[PDB]
Amino acid sequence: NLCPFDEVFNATRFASVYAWNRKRISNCVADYSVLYPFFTFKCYGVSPTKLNDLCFTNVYADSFVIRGDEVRQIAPGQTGNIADYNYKLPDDFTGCVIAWNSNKLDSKVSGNYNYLYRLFRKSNLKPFERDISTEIYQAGNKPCNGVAGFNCYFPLRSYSFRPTYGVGHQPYRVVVLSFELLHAPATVCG
């Protein structure tokens, strides 16, 4: 039995970080031998050397695309635009983060504007909270009235992805795995 990691990691086109794609994995043998280019592999709270021999209830695969400078924000207890308003990990996070450069796929000479991130948000984000609304942000006492003028801006800002940009600004495909152990009989066992 094979867990559907092929669809997760080798997806043709990922989603923006403001609306990140969550996939639930259960009832399959989870083998991490598949995770075998130049990528970052950070595991929090678990021993990465024996993820294959570790049996637990649910796997949550969350996939999103961010810049290279924002990869370090995907970690427990980190503060930043992505962490605060787009995607936040909890303090006690039992899982792993996998990020790899994707300049070949998610960049074009004209510029890639299919990816967006939430810039303006009144409050912070609870862990694993998804903010999809696109209402105009009120930065002043005057109403936005559904119009985007002074002190009333669209909350979603597009990324600028070009092949000629530096490594820090290049698009990075990030997949974070959240492992959940439940009192109910687990059904993900490598």
Partner: peptide, 8 residues
């Protein structure tokens, strides 16, 4: 004035 510091 005319700026909400909590929202900026």
């Amino acid at each position: 004035s005319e700026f909400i510091v909590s929202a900026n």
